[PDB]
Amino acid sequence: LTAEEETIVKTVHDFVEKQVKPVVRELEHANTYPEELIETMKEIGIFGLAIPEPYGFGAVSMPCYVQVAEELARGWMSLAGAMGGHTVVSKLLLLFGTEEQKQKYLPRMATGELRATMALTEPGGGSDLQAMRTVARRDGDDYVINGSKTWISNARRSDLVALMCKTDPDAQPAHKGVSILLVEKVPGFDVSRDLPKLGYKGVESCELNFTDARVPVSSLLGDDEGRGFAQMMKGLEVGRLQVAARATGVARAAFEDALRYSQERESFGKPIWQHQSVGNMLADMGTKLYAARSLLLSAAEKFDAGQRCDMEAGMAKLFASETAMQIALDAVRVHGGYGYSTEYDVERYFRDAPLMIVGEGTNEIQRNVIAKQLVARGGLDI
Amino acid sequence: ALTAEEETIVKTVHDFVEKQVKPVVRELEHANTYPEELIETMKEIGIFGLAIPEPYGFGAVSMPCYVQVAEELARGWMSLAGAMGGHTVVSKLLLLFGTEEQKQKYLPRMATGELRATMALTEPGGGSDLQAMRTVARRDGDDYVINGSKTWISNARRSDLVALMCKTDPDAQPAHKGVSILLVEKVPGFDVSRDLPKLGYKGVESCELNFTDARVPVSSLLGDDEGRGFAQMMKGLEVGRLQVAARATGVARAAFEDALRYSQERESFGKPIWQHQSVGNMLADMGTKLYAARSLLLSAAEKFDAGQRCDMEAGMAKLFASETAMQIALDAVRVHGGYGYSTEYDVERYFRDAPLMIVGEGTNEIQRNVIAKQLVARGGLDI
Amino acid sequence: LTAEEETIVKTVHDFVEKQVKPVVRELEHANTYPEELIETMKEIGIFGLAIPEPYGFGAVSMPCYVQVAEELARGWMSLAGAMGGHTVVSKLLLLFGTEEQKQKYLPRMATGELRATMALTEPGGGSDLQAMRTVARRDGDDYVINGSKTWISNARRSDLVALMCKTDPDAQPAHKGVSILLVEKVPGFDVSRDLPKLGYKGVESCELNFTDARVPVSSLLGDDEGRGFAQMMKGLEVGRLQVAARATGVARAAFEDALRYSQERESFGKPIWQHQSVGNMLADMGTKLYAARSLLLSAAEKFDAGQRCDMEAGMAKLFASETAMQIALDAVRVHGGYGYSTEYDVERYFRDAPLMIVGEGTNEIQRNVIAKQLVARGGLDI
Amino acid sequence: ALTAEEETIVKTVHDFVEKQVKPVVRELEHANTYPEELIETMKEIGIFGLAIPEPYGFGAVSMPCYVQVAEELARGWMSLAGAMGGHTVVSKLLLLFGTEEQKQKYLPRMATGELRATMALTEPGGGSDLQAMRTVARRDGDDYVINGSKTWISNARRSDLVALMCKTDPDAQPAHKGVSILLVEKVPGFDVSRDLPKLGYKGVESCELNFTDARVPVSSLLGDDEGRGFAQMMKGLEVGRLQVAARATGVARAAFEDALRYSQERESFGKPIWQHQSVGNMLADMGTKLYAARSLLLSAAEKFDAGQRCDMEAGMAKLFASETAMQIALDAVRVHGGYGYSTEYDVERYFRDAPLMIVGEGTNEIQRNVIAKQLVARGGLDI
Numbered sequence A, C: 001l002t003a004e005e006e007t008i009v010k011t012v013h014d015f016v017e018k019q020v021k022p023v024v025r026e027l028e029h030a031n032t033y034p035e036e037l038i039e040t041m042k043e044i045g046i047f048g049l050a051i052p053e054p055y056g057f058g059a060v061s062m063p064c065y066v067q068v069a070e071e072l073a074r075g076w077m078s079l080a081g082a083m084g085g086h087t088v089v090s091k092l093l094l095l096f097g098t099e100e101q102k103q104k105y106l107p108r109m110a111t112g113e114l115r116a117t118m119a120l121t122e123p124g125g126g127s128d129l130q131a132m133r134t135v136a137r138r139d140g141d142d143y144v145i146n147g148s149k150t151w152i153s154n155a156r157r158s159d160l161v162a163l164m165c166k167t168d169p170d171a172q173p174a175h176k177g178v179s180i181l182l183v184e185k186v187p188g189f190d191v192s193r194d195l196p197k198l199g200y201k202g203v204e205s206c207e208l209n210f211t212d213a214r215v216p217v218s219s220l221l222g223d224d225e226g227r228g229f230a231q232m233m234k235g236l237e238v239g240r241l242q243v244a245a246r247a248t249g250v251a252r253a254a255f256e257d258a259l260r261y262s263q264e265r266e267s268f269g270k271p272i273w274q275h276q277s278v279g280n281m282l283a284d285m286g287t288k289l290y291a292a293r294s295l296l297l298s299a300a301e302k303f304d305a306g307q308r309c310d311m312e313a314g315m316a317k318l319f320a321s322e323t324a325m326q327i328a329l330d331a332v333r334v335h336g337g338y339g340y341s342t343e344y345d346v347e348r349y350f351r352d353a354p355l356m357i358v359g360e361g362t363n364e365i366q367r368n369v370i371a372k373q374l375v376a377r378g379g380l381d382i
Numbered sequence B, D: 001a002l003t004a005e006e007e008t009i010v011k012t013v014h015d016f017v018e019k020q021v022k023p024v025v026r027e028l029e030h031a032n033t034y035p036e037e038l039i040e041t042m043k044e045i046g047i048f049g050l051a052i053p054e055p056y057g058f059g060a061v062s063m064p065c066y067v068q069v070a071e072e073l074a075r076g077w078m079s080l081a082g083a084m085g086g087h088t089v090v091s092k093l094l095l096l097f098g099t100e101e102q103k104q105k106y107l108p109r110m111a112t113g114e115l116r117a118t119m120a121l122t123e124p125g126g127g128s129d130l131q132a133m134r135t136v137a138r139r140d141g142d143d144y145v146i147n148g149s150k151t152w153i154s155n156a157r158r159s160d161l162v163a164l165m166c167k168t169d170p171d172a173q174p175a176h177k178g179v180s181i182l183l184v185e186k187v188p189g190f191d192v193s194r195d196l197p198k199l200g201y202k203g204v205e206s207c208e209l210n211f212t213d214a215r216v217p218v219s220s221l222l223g224d225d226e227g228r229g230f231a232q233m234m235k236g237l238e239v240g241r242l243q244v245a246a247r248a249t250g251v252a253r254a255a256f257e258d259a260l261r262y263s264q265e266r267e268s269f270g271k272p273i274w275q276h277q278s279v280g281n282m283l284a285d286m287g288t289k290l291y292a293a294r295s296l297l298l299s300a301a302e303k304f305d306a307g308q309r310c311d312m313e314a315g316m317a318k319l320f321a322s323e324t325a326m327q328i329a330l331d332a333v334r335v336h337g338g339y340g341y342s343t344e345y346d347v348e349r350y351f352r353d354a355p356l357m358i359v360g361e362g363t364n365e366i367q368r369n370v371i372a373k374q375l376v377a378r379g380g381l382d383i
């Protein structure tokens, strides 16, 4: 990384060590929205990491970005979650947005004055998006939106929502009917309920209801209707990389606590790491985490070099997310009974890890996508 | 075969779980509310007397029946099985090792649940390395004077008899011959100090205990001789490991049932999700492992009951079932997709409860050590 | 088990200890057909374990049967393989055969004078049997058979082959066109080639070619054409149980060698089992093997009690077969470098284990079948 | 970035594998035939001089290039990478620790393959517990007199220089300071006793060595001082672990390629088998793990080359890649169904070769022990 990029990663690490870690336990326990921490994140530039001049201060490299996201997640997964969707919307705007849209939204998004999130998932399905029921019917110079979404993260605090919806529910082929609309908080758009979650606490995830919600037709992302799927798929290069960084972040936290505790707790006359059963866990955890970060960093470099990286980003997400779950459980084992205590942090990492497996696209879907990609590519890029 | 009465008790407990436990468990468990009404119904059912024969109680069910009762309870809510586990182990220790006076003093009120008991072994400085324990009981006239501390003691507040493993001779040679078990009532100097906040196993309290100059009569000693605490506990761990294995198969049954049901209710891409191989494969693996774990458990319970050696088999049951329940709990979350993460669904609770049987009822690392040594002592499996 | 059944299991165990184990290494290495050992197996009654009076001495209980098969496999998997298909054909004859067929074949099968095997698999597919190309066209009082099978075990030494084939390739629905024929070694039926295998050595597995091979129409198993699938599916209750017993057998052998070696080999001043890394493997191996046998024995009892046991038999096969593979590799680990030497037996168990995973129906298919069964049943039988 | 010449060498080795190795490997490997022609072509290519710089040889490639060459070789046939592994490690030990005389005596003929070297550490009594080794070298005038035995020594017959770890002072205090490495030629008393029959790694011999009153000059000592054998070997194990990791990723690449190709050629139930999720999922998991393992390997190779600490990272690469190759090899067998079991297909060979990198190049149990200790010494990962 360049010195400027190294400095950014260090500022975030120091932010996590000095500001996040002292307060996270109490806030996460009470499901308190971390306003002060988020505000500091806006000040250091977290909400503009993908936004270049003239709209923002500059788009850091993807290797820098994943390190930032990892550092945040290592302190508290929810903080990285607070900017994940926002970064994806940023990227979608840059790739596909009109000049007017980019100009309208990107400058305030970069400071975090305006936050954005992604609304794809419907109550009837998050995987089978083609079956979605949310429609956007053209009426004069407006779309009239009727439907619902759920599990939408940061939905209350985000005043721009990238809504995947059916601009033509009767299109043939059906993919021509699906678009992305950039939807502000207009009448008829209700953020109807906060959903109670195992982990990812502090950040709200919500049901959305649209009852004849009118938005200008200029809300369309890009010039053409029916590009929503192709657009999303490109968005997922960044999405999958950030989720993977979230997972290596949670894994780092759990591994660090486990390794530290194994030196401080003794049994049968020695530090517990010197029992092979515990040392073996530490060796496996560290080795898999090194593999996971190595893969992540490799995928990020491919992204940065402008090479095809869609499969690689997916593999990063699959591997890191499964790895973080394994590491989290083993960190609990290393603490013995104290692993089960809410006065230690490992139980929280254990609660947080599944989010990246089931709640950021599923890993079953991710495997299906990787298999298709392997066949298309003919193997790994070696 | 289970006797008539034994089949009936299992059914009664299943019905209690379906009609009384399941409709209130979310609210109680989420609020960490002590389930006083549910536990009282368990007392009436006879749950606290399952190992207590006549003349003290209304009959000791077979071990295969006992594990099925524990499994049914845990299927509804792991914590309700936890409520009676240590009590059962103490019941057994009294029968195996107690004087006639002790058995008569405690077992009749234990069988009804009027008196509850728990086991206190774990110290803040270690639950595995018990030889290093600091709790001491020193003879002074016809009392023991107890000083020290224990922690993670389940049901310590609601239990008014505690089987306390402590050093009656800290200078013993060999050192393991200095450890005994005392049956300690709630005497002056015995403080039940605080409820420890936990990931799961909610509703049931686990506590730190502090003993300051706590006087009990020397008749509190379990058995006639000091220095047999470890031997006695080993024998108690046969019951303990089987009951923990049953907790784990019960939690597994609950997670698996929910996942299988959900996989038929939820559809994607035009069909019930079980018909996608990625999901159907998880169900097949879950169901297959669960069948393996219950088969192992029931085999070990029958060996216990046939009077055959079952110490290794009980540890195997605990190890296999607890690891299996954790695997099944996670996969049940996966089957639910995003809803697996919601506390309005039950699979997140099983996921939070499953690690308890792995790290908090003796650890699985210690359990493998014990099994390796037993395999060598035995020369392999009993075949 | 009854005393008679205990005695049978003991006779086989003693046969394995006294006769098999001294010679297996040299024979298996050279792919030598174990004629003497097979002949002894005929003499002790292995080929009539499922054949009742009046045709044979008696059908042992399924719990007895799985213990016999396990004992054989523990000495050498190939020996249990030599009687597996034969037992299934025995069972198919008893369940579905005419009185004439049963009388013709079962008495000689019970002594092993006549051996039988199952021929389902085609070169084009062993899983997708409905797509099979082998046809049996009626011409007068004969079927004329044209096609091919492959991976047919014991095909040279078996003079009766239960051939799944299409008696009506145009049937609608297509399952009405599939039958089982009991085919003797007639002209036009070539056992064309022996296939070289990783393990399962000593026993031949062959390609079969049928070129206008004529058999009497009385060769049909049962009175009706188009019952082949339903018949096979019933045959697989016994098939899956025997394969599961083969796996627990190989697992017992590998575990026993590993446990023994861990007491006899020392490093850093002590027997290697006392290193937790090795002890942990032994504990896991023993525990999983106990689970596997417990499940197997439970499924066998259900079979014997006449309760539905099809899912259970499949679960037994899946679990035991995966377990034996895991145990075999770990037995190799326990031996260190000597695990890799062909002068020790663990490499052979390692080569043999995959057979039960890929070569006795696949475990992927087995999982699909179990999922369907779980949905049909509504869960486990508890 | 790889230099021009470095990219070219990798391509040359890939082409050699595709055109020369693959068409003959089955017949040779099945017959345990020493691949003399293939190895001779490897000599001409420069394979035996990859770590030997000027003035001794035509240049030491970077470590990232080296691992890619080793991986390409192993992809074709694990045994061909094995043929040059120990030779590379000895090359490095000579460069790090040898006198000018030793370097000049051996490295020029080593670089061409005219002289081959191997490492002899493992004893019949143990390959892990090397401190317990029985091979001794006792000074007598200006000779060492060597007595003892080694086993599993790869390429012992074809290699005419053996780096022998032995006790120059069996009474040393501390005991580890009695162990040295001697560069031993094929002298009277040094018997290469027999080729050990193996599950895989065929074509290349592994042998028992027996030393009886075997005299070598004292100048055979690697370095100026006795008692540094363990320290020197640790340094050599950086190269050794990286090369073994590369063998494992190479074998994995071969198994994965075959499985992916087969999954497109074979159809069932109306489609290419990859389109059944059970198969596609295996491919996704295989490809994902392989990518992880190669990423880790290349990261560790770059650290080596940047002069950064890489001792833990090399062990991690070996552990992860070897376990990954075994998993991928089995799943490739599964993908082929029954044909996976046929010796007319190649996946059975990868399956037989993969355990070598787990149990026979230091064990993975020892490797985890080493990694745990390193993690503690370091305080975690280098991040």
Ligand SMILES: Cc1cc2c(cc1C)N(C[C@H](O)[C@H](O)[C@H](O)COP(=O)(O)OP(=O)(O)OC[C@H]1O[C@@H](n3cnc4c(N)ncnc43)[C@H](O)[C@@H]1O)c1[nH]c(=O)[nH]c(=O)c1N2
Binding pocket: A265, A266, A267, A268, A272, A275, A276, A277, A278, A333, A334, A335, A336, A337, A338, A340, B086, B118, B119, B120, B121, B122, B125, B126, B127, B128, B129, B151, B152, B153, B154, B155, B198, B201, B206, B356, B359, B360, B361, B362, B363, B364, B365, B366, B369, C276
């Ligand atoms: C909610 C709840 C409820 C209860 C309990 C726990 C919890 C969490 N337990 C306490 C429980 O039995 C205890 O946690 C375990 O004995 C493990 O103890 P430590 O936490 O001290 O692990 P400890 O500090 O011993 O071990 C930490 C880690 O090192 C490992 N380790 C330690 N020594 C080792 C060795 N020699 N070899 C290999 N690995 C080794 C452990 O396996 C673990 O991974 C208890 N107790 C009680 O007495 N009565 C009760 O009612 C309950 N109930």
Ligand SMILES: Cc1cc2c(cc1C)N(C[C@H](O)[C@H](O)[C@H](O)COP(=O)(O)OP(=O)(O)OC[C@H]1O[C@@H](n3cnc4c(N)ncnc43)[C@H](O)[C@@H]1O)c1[nH]c(=O)[nH]c(=O)c1N2
Binding pocket: A085, A117, A118, A119, A120, A121, A124, A125, A126, A127, A128, A150, A151, A152, A153, A154, A197, A200, A205, A355, A358, A359, A360, A361, A362, A363, A364, A365, A368, B266, B267, B268, B269, B273, B276, B277, B278, B279, B334, B335, B336, B337, B338, B339, B341, D277
């Ligand atoms: C806390 C939190 C936060 C968020 C989100 C979730 C959660 C829990 N998500 C929603 C998330 O992406 C969603 O849960 C997943 O897409 C999975 O969707 P379903 O729950 O609908 O699984 P679904 O019902 O699709 O699947 C259920 C199970 O079946 C499997 N399955 C389904 N179809 C299959 C197939 N064809 N093949 C194989 N297996 C198949 C799945 O893998 C899963 O195991 C979200 N969404 C969003 O739009 N914006 C957001 O901000 C967030 N944030």
Ligand SMILES: Cc1cc2c(cc1C)N(C[C@H](O)[C@H](O)[C@H](O)COP(=O)(O)OP(=O)(O)OC[C@H]1O[C@@H](n3cnc4c(N)ncnc43)[C@H](O)[C@@H]1O)c1[nH]c(=O)[nH]c(=O)c1N2
Binding pocket: A276, C265, C266, C267, C268, C272, C275, C276, C277, C278, C333, C334, C335, C336, C337, C338, C340, D086, D118, D119, D120, D121, D122, D125, D126, D127, D128, D129, D151, D152, D153, D154, D155, D198, D201, D206, D356, D359, D360, D361, D362, D363, D364, D365, D366, D369
């Ligand atoms: C084909 C082939 C080729 C070669 C070699 C092997 C093979 C099979 N090796 C030998 C190889 O390095 C050796 O096998 C390993 O060092 C393991 O040694 P043992 O077989 O003596 O295992 P050992 O007897 O040390 O161990 C047996 C089991 O116990 C475990 N164990 C032992 N001590 C332990 C501890 N303290 N803690 C935890 N677990 C422990 C091991 O991990 C293993 O599971 C070799 N050598 C050489 O010098 N030069 C060469 O060229 C080759 N090449």
Ligand SMILES: Cc1cc2c(cc1C)N(C[C@H](O)[C@H](O)[C@H](O)COP(=O)(O)OP(=O)(O)OC[C@H]1O[C@@H](n3cnc4c(N)ncnc43)[C@H](O)[C@@H]1O)c1[nH]c(=O)[nH]c(=O)c1N2
Binding pocket: B277, C085, C117, C118, C119, C120, C121, C124, C125, C126, C127, C128, C150, C151, C152, C153, C154, C197, C200, C205, C355, C358, C359, C360, C361, C362, C363, C364, C365, C368, D266, D267, D268, D269, D273, D276, D277, D278, D279, D334, D335, D336, D337, D338, D339, D341
């Ligand atoms: C040594 C030996 C001995 C015997 C046999 C094999 C071998 C190797 N078998 C044949 C064996 O039963 C056969 O190999 C299996 O049925 C698998 O068949 P294919 O190899 O055709 O796999 P196939 O080509 O069907 O499958 C290839 C891969 O795709 C997977 N797959 C295929 N369809 C799928 C689907 N719908 N969903 C998910 N995954 C799917 C498979 O699981 C496998 O991983 C046999 N047969 C016989 O009739 N008589 C005998 O005596 C013997 N004995």
